[PDB]
């Protein structure tokens, strides 16, 4: 955002929307891949507490750790705290989830992760 | 005399500039720089 003459130089997704509080416009401009754009947005949002420092935002981009209540987690662990198998979020077996893939598509709902 | 101009007879001698025919290359005089600052007075700034 700062260093006004940045909009004439080429840019770095990391030298605009990472090491600096950025516009989703410059984010949109730099991303275009609107799926990953939503991903980066989701990042930003969850990383709202990971805005600083820089390496914290880098880790929040890695996504292996759940931020706060766990909106950002994108790992491969699909097991409950006590070893019970996780039911498919979209499937109705054995429970029909009021809160499921249709209601939360932006969390990247995997098989049972 | 010929270095004066009379309009009535359209009388005005034709001559070349002395420097055009014989150049005198003395370079220039550019010891000091010569800069163009930005309108506000400070360009890039920062928040504090
Ligand atoms: Ca900037
Ligand atoms: Ca900017
Ligand atoms: Ca900068
Ligand atoms: Ca731009
Ligand atoms: Ca830019
Ligand atoms: Ca950097």
From Swiss-Prot, chain A:
What glycosylation sites does the entry record? Answer: 78, 100
Could you name the domain of life of the organism this protein comes from? Eukaryota
**Annotated Kringle domain residues:** 65-113
In this UniProt entry, the residues modified to 4-carboxyglutamate are 6-7, 14, 16, 19-20, 25-26, 29, 32
Specify the Gla domain's residue ranges. 1-46
Residue pairs linked by disulfide bridges in the UniProt entry: 17-22, 47-60
Put simply, this protein is called: Activation peptide fragment 1
* The organism of origin for this protein: Homo sapiens (Human)
